[PDB]
Structure 1
């Protein structure tokens, strides 16, 4: 995200990039969000 702002990337790219950052931040706090994908550990086992 920092490079995109530094390089003045497309607004939609940042908007999509921000969405992924929001997912991981929310996912780390809680991996059982309502009606949202479960972030596995690359093996089908949901992260705690």
Structure 2
């Protein structure tokens, strides 16, 4: 069970939009912004800042 939780935490740290899985949440239901989301698209790192 703890291995499963660690796997979930790492995966949601990198990608928090996986279909089917629960969403890593900060507080009041606000989902975390993962590393993938920082770079994804419009307003992301590449398109938005380079």
* TM > 0.5: yes
SS of corresponding position for 1:35: coil
Give ranges in structure 1 of 5+ residues lacking alignment: 1-15
Larger radius of gyration: 1
User: Which structure is higher in helix share?
Assistant: 1
Give ranges in structure 2 of 5+ residues lacking alignment: 34-50
Bigger RCO of structures 1 and 2 (CA < 8 A, at least 6 apart): 2
Which runs of 4 or more aligned residues in structure 1 lie more than 4 Å from their structure 2 counterparts after TM superposition? none
